[PDB]
Amino acid sequence: FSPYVFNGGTILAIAGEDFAIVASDTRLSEGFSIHTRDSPKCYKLTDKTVIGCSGFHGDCLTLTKIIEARLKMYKHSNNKAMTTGAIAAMLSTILYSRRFFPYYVYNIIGGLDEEGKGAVYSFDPVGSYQRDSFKAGGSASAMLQPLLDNQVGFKNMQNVEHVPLSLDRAMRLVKDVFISAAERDVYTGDALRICIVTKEGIREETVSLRKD
């Protein structure tokens, strides 16, 4: 008996000056088969925070329910909603509690900081987390990170002006990167769920990818 199964899934998160974009594909798979062509991997935790989860869907469903309970429990004892950084810190402890039987999940939290700026925190299966400006996770993490490092980071490029990232360029980059991943990753490619966090709230958009 093997307690884990890779169910596929790609998650991306880009932080801006007033917006944070968490995005994911909507494909659940087991082996060379497709369970559902409509399973988004993004979850709204607060009006200012969304988490993306990929790996073993059994552990993903459990962790999100554990996180939602812990968020309500923090509000009951502290009389205030949890910050994106507080959720990032708690997740690291919730993940390391299962160090000897880890949750096979890759988590990227996107939200606004207490100053209203975007905040992306990337997490490893057993805890390790870090604030980043952009992060891809899941099946096509290695196919999406390189272009984001070049376009959003402006790396390996000379004589190029480092303009601040607009939401529109961020939106177009997210869509373009997922279309390239869909053409080369077999686990990514049903639809794209883009969730955008701003002062107004978490707007959600869905685009179509390629059905195998």
Binding site: Y96, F100, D124, V126, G127, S128, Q130, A142
Partner: protein
């Protein structure tokens, strides 16, 4: 990972790289591997990122409870013993954690190497990580207790740079801290790419 620490005439110099890897995939090149337990005590992280980060944060919370209860900051020796005793309880279970606890106590500048395999040793110069061997050669040929502060800073940066060059798992920026009686300071975070141009 290449972490370095040496005790000289003007205190203790602590240096590290910034690369984190998931296999042969560079997950990050901006990881902070030096933990500020107190304004005067710092820990370095080499091995499992989650393991090292979790137990140094547990040591920081334990060292604060010590200051509140005993109205005095823990010694570098007492902090290293807590970490060693904590990790010993899970010996053989697979924790990978190589660390260096550096600071200024009432006995003066202190540097301790605590591993997840039960090792706790004091010393003047330690280097932990996959680039430790590469860094030891340079720091040893340039180490001197009577080294000047700027010479000590340059030695730490060169030793980390020469290891980021020979070790595939080490790279990013050399982050340098200087622990002194007034407390540690963050001297610099130079990228190895700009140091390749300087050292050539």
């Amino acid at each position: 990972t290449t972490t370095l620490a040496f005790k000289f005439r003007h205190g203790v110099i602590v240096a590290a790289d910034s690369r984190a890897t998931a296999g042969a995939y560079i997950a990050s090149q901006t990881v902070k591997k030096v933990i500020e337990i107190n304004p005067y005590l710092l820990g370095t992280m080499a091995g499992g990122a989650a393991d090292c980060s979790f137990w140094e944060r547990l040591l920081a919370r334990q060292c604060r409870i010590y200051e509140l209860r005993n109205k005095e900051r823990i010694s570098v020796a007492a902090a290293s013993k807590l970490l060693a005793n904590m990790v010993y309880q899970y010996k053989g279970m697979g924790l990978s954690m190589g660390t260096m606890i550096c600071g200024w106590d009432k006995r003066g500048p202190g540097l301790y190497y605590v591993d997840s395999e039960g090792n706790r040793i004091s010393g003047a110069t330690f280097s932990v990580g996959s680039g430790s061997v590469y860094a030891y050669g340079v720091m040893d040929r340039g180490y001197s207790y009577d080294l000047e502060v700027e010479q000590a800073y340059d030695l730490a940066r060169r030793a980390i740079y020469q290891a980021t060059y020979r070790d595939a798992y080490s790279g990013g920026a050399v982050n340098l801290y200087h622990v002194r009686e007034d407390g540690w300071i963050r001297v610099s975070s130079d990228n190895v790419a700009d140091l390749h141009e300087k050292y050539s």
